RNA sequence: CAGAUCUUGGUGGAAGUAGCAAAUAUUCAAAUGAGAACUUUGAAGACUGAAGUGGGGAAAGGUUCCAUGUGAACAGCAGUUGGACAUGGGUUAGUCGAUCCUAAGAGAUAGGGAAGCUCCGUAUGAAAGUUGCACGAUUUUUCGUGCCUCCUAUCGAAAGGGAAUCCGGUUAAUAUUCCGGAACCAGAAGGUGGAAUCAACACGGCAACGUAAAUGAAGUUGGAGACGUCGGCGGGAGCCCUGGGAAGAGUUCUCUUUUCUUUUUAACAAACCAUUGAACUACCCUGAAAUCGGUUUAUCCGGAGCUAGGGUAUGGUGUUUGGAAGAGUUCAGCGCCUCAUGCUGAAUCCGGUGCGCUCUCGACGGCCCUUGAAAAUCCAACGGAAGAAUGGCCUUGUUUUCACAUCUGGUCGUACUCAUAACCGCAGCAGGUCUCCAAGGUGAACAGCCUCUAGUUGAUAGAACAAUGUAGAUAAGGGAAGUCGGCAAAAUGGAUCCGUAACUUCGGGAUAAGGAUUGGCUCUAAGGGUUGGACAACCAACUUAGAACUGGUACGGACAAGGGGAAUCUGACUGUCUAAUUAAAACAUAGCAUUGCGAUGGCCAGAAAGUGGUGUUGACGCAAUGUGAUU
RNA sequence: GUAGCCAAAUGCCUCGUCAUCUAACUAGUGACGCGCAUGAAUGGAUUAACGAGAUUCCCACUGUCCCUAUCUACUAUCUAG
């Protein structure tokens, strides 16, 4: 069953804090506490550990990632990594 | 008296005062039954009454609720034997 | 408190300087426990035998000291 | 039912206060005060517990036998089977590869 | 409390020997008036304040 | 009247709650390494820092005098992983989590935890999700302008170090703390500086607002640049005030 | 001196007055005594009712502890009694603390301020050196230079970190401290035994890894110490409950193969060990998985090697033993002035149970713009310093990280109370003061109510039943007419099944509202485990639903335990404050907005400084204001 | 003086005026508005949920009342101290 129409995690706060802030908290916690894949295994074992890092599970990768609060990657450190790899291959030639 | 309650004497409405949960938690019940659909799904598989793909399937559908207890799942085991030695019968011939 | 569970063992340690005496213990089943005080430890050993226990007894060093419960 | 006391004038539920219940051959029912649990030495390359290590206070592996507190192994009792594994398998190839880079640089 | 310093043991020694009664003799003396003191700690009545 | 609030945050009570930090977040010392070539560290761990937004790195350098190894305290840039290659010096190459002398790198990229001078070990763009841009080099008399995140133009040394790449932990700001207990928790480990009371709801005695039958402030917020301590409250020496509609 | 609300002292009328009424409660007999409502003994009646009126501690007190006496003062009545008074006695440690370590912090020194008292500062702008090498030194060993290297004051925890002790007994009064027995730790020297080494420092296993030992200097690196919180799940120990046997006791008109009590096993040591309870928890080997499988209560795991088969490790609050029945407990007799209070017999046995309770361990799951000390100390590795047995054997060094053995373990605390009488509150004050253990029934329950173990029966007493009180009950008919105002009281109340509006931020509103039922007895049905040859005779079990009968038309029978609804003002919410007249609409808050500042800086400090905070900081920051969720 | 809001915890006049409820209301609610002296983060308006906050009403209920009565314990009272 459904069980929520709208608020989904943020059901937790009941009827408190204000519908707009309840859902831009629900589009933030969604984000945080979702799997995403690790580049170096191809597993989906990547979750969060405090804000900025992720942490790998299994026997293989156990390494840490440095990455958003809230995602694995920004926006801004995606777009900052292929203007840095664009400028290292145009002094490099 | 606690050998007459055995019997089922002084358990009517009017004698509790717990609620149904209070009195029995509903996840106990659970754990119990899904306990022992388990054991018997084992137990099937290892003597051979019940292969592997089949095991699966009735390992899932116990988790998802579909018997009430071992009855039901043991009917149920022998209407999918019956149907299953039929195809087999059918194909042979 | 240690338990010794070969005679030979046990009567080895007897003949040793810092075993000063021996305790006969007979337990209501008929069991005998030999026991050996030394400066660390007690060394039981257990003979279930009667003729066993005699023989043990009479297999001690002469010196050593035997003391009945 | 019998009730205990602390044998200690420490009074609080510390993690030094940590008690047992024993029943002893006078019928008494009364505390044990007993120390915190050991712990296994970890691989110092993957955190891993170490096999073949009892799980003791530090000071207590001061008493130990030797072997008791290693395995018969390079980096035995410091890094685990694996974690030895891997470093000698990289070593080698890095040392290859250093070979190899130095043959081509002529 | 039980748990006690030497030195803070010392002075209840000390305090428990001035806490006692004069012997006669000394009051007898020609020329004394040692009969009645006002020095009789008791414990719950006048504290000590370390 | 007393003392203000403002007055008394000069230590005490005042202070950093430190005791759950590990280390300060530092560049490395400027050496002839990294002075003349580069110099390899290995990324050990990347943790959270009590207080912080960004994770921390640490990374561990061999000593090139002793048999010994330095670990040092990074910020660590998005992208970083434990068990990665940096490469601190003038001969590293432009990669996300090396560090080189912001001379050394194109107009354009993309840094963080820049030094204001050469060897101070990092100042600019160091909070999480920040970077400072290099916007153009001159060579005689080496200076690198840069842009800070306020938006300021800097003038720093083209010997001054910065890392390559934005500061981990991403758009913290982005999510409501939706409650006191949140704001609570983050302020606990940093400093005594919430919950706070609005100074006209404070008597006269407390605060140039404080007083009157109803709440208000009576004189101008903004207030001169050269008030003393104890008036020097509400809007210092503000250029405008009001909502803005466009700027820049 | 008549005065000054004069000063100090003494003493009046009010007066034998106000009063000595919270915390259920006392009674009978005896003894002692000049004297007994209050002492002691026995009997009865009761209470605290395990979140205790019980058993201990921390802080604080300091002898209040114990024995023998006393009874002036004190114990707001009494006193033969007392925490009072007098005379004596009493606290035993290598293992419990302190002591050692570091924490926030304190703080000498360098150095700089300051007229100065002193202030700042803590490897700091210091020539701040305990440690690593044998070059001399006979000759079998730590005193001379040496060249050396990122060391460091100290104080700060009787709840943090931390070497090591248990049982039984014993005193008037101490006990993990004494006694008996049984252990353990640390340090020193090296007292034996063993092991390796004929040239060098062992073997086994594919491996995980194993062993009685198995040379390892400097330096380095790693580990332990070492860490939040909630949730359920699995095991263990003690407790609880249950079925037999035994021993003693209670009841016994009748009944009750009955009811009650006892039926115990430590530290330490050894071997096993997922069996018997809890593992495929971690790892290894074989092998190579789609018709994908495995699998938890909880959906995680696998070509980065699943399932399966076999191994390896982790190991006790588990098993089998030693300790250890010789102890402890219960019972029955003998000497009988009996003494050292001795002596002699029996039993102390065999089973089961769990959403139980308390503690604990194991594997997990959730949460954070919160990610949850340090140091002493102990261990391991990488490394290779150094060694000198040799004449095929009588001949050394190492190992004491292998076994047994020897010596040594100082110093301070240790009585007692921990509170309706040992502390603070002027006091033997209905106030206050941190924490550990925690039985049976009812029940959801650490609720209320009753009880067992333990404790207490202490709160001046006797007689009487006037008005007016304080506290607690009830009331015909009416039902808020009372009153500023339903103030106070009444009513509601548990559980099960039905049913549930506006409005809404879609989460709620909601136990909305509004109905029905509820005992006892006798049955029926369904839902799980052990176990013998499609099946099955017990044993071990707990629920739920229903039927008939029945009586006070009753049954959450005491106890326990929401009244509900329609609107307006106001603050969004949880939170906070005027200790002792104001709890609110006040404050805070998330959210919104504005301001300063890029460090030669902003804000704050200081008498000064070679000074401090923000700052272990860097605009997703710090500082300064306003407004007050959302829309 | 815009959007809003109002005899509002802000309106003197004032018991404003109309409507509603009542047998009857200077209350309350809804409207109205030249508003003495409402009004926009000196924040205006609205608002589900929450409130030992303030205010009006309805049902339940009842000794608050008509109109008082009765009973228990401890006092008061008399006695000893
Ligand atoms: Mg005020
Ligand atoms: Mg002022
Ligand atoms: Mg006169
Ligand atoms: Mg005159
Ligand atoms: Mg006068
Ligand atoms: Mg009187
Ligand atoms: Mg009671
Ligand atoms: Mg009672
Ligand atoms: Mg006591
Ligand atoms: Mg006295
Ligand atoms: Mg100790
Ligand atoms: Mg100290
Ligand atoms: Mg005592
Ligand atoms: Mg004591
Ligand atoms: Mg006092
Ligand atoms: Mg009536
Ligand atoms: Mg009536
Ligand atoms: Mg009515
Ligand atoms: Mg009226
Ligand atoms: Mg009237
Ligand atoms: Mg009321
Ligand atoms: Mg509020
Ligand atoms: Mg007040
Ligand atoms: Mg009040
Ligand atoms: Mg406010
Ligand atoms: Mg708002
Ligand atoms: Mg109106
Ligand atoms: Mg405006
Ligand atoms: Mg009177
Ligand atoms: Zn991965």
Same mark, same amino acid.
């Given at each position: ?74 926006? !801004?450190?995606?777009? !900052? ?13 | ?93 | ?69 | ?106 | ?50 | ?88 010096? *003038? ?62 133009? *800097? ?30 928790? *983050? ?62």
């Amino acid at each position: 069953t459904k069980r929520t129409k709208k608020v989904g995690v943020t059901g937790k706060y009941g009827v408190r804090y204000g519908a707009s802030l309840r859902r831009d908290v629900r589009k933030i916690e969604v984000q945080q506490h979702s799997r995403y894949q690790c580049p170096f295994c191809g597993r989906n074992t990547v979750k969060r550990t405090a804000a900025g890092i992720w942490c790998c599970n299994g026997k293989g990768c156990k390494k840490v990632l440095a990455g958003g609060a809230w995602t694995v990657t920004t926006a !801004a450190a995606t777009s !900052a990594r292929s203007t840095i790899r664009r400028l290292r291959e145009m002094v490099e030639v | 008296t606690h050998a007459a309650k055995r019997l089922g004497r002084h358990t009517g409405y009017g004698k509790r005062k717990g609620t149904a949960e209070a009195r029995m938690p509903s996840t106990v019940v659970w754990m119990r039954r899904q306990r022992v659909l388990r054991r018997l799904l084992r137990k099937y598989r290892e003597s051979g009454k019940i292969d592997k793909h089949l095991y699966h399937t009735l390992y899932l559908e116990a988790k998802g609720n579909t018997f009430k207890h071992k009855r039901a799942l043991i009917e149920h085991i022998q209407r999918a034997k019956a149907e299953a030695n039929r195809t087999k019968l059918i194909q042979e011939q | 408190p240690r338990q010794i569970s070969d005679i030979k063992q046990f009567l080895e340690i007897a003949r040793r300087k810092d075993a000063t005496s021996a305790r006969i213990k007979k337990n209501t089943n008929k069991d005998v426990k030999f026991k050996l005080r030394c400066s660390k430890y007690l060394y039981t050993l257990v003979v279930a035998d009667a003729k066993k226990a005699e023989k043990l007894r009479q297999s001690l060093p002469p010196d050593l000291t035997v003391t009945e419960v | 039912a019998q009730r205990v006391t602390y044998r200690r004038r420490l009074a609080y539920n510390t993690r030094s206060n940590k008690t047992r219940i024993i029943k002893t051959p006078g019928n008494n029912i009364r505390y044990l005060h007993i120390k915190k649990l050991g712990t296994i030495p970890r691989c110092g390359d993957t955190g891993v517990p170490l096999q073949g290590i009892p799980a003791l206070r530090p000071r207590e592996f001061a008493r130990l036998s030797h072997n008791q507190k290693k395995v018969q192994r390079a980096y035995g009792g410091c890094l685990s089977a694996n974690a030895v594994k891997d470093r000698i398998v990289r070593a080698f190839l890095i040392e290859e590869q250093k070979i190899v880079k130095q043959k081509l640089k002529q | 409390p039980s748990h006690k310093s030497f030195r803070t043991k010392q002075k209840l020694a000390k305090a428990a020997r001035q806490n006692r009664p004069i012997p006669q003799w000394i009051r007898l003396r020609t020329g004394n008036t040692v009969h009645y003191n006002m020095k009789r700690r008791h414990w719950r009545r006048t504290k000590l304040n370390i | 009247g007393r003392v203000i609030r403002a007055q008394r945050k000069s230590g005490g009570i005042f202070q950093a709650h430190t005791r759950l930090r590990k280390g300060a977040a530092q560049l490395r010392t400027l050496d002839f390494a990294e002075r003349h070539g580069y110099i390899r560290g290995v990324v050990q761990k990347i943790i959270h820092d009590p207080g912080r937004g960004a994770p921390l790195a640490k990374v561990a350098f061999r000593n090139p005098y002793h048999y010994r190894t330095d670990v040092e305290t990074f910020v660590a840039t998005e992208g970083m992983y434990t068990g990665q290659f940096v490469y601190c010096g *003038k001969n590293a190459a432009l990669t996300v989590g090396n560090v080189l002398p912001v001379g050394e790198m194109p107009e354009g990229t993309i840094i963080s935890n820049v030094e204001e001078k050469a060897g101070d070990r990092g100042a600019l763009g160091r909070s999480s999700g920040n970077y400072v841009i290099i916007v153009g080099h001159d060579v005689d008399t080496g200076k690198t302008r840069v842009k800070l995140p306020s938006g300021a133009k *800097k003038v720093v040394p083209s010997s001054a170090r910065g890392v390559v790449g934005i500061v981990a932990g991403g758009g913290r700001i982005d999510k409501p703390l939706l409650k006191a207990g949140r704001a609570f928790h *983050k302020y606990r480990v940093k400093r005594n500086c919430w919950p706070r009371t609005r100074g006209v709801a404070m008597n006269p005695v407390d605060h140039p607002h404080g007083g009157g039958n109803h709440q208000h402030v009576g004189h101008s917020t903004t207030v001169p640049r050269q008030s003393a301590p104890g008036q020097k409250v509400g809007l210092i020496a503000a250029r405008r005030t009001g909502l803005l509609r466009g700027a820049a």
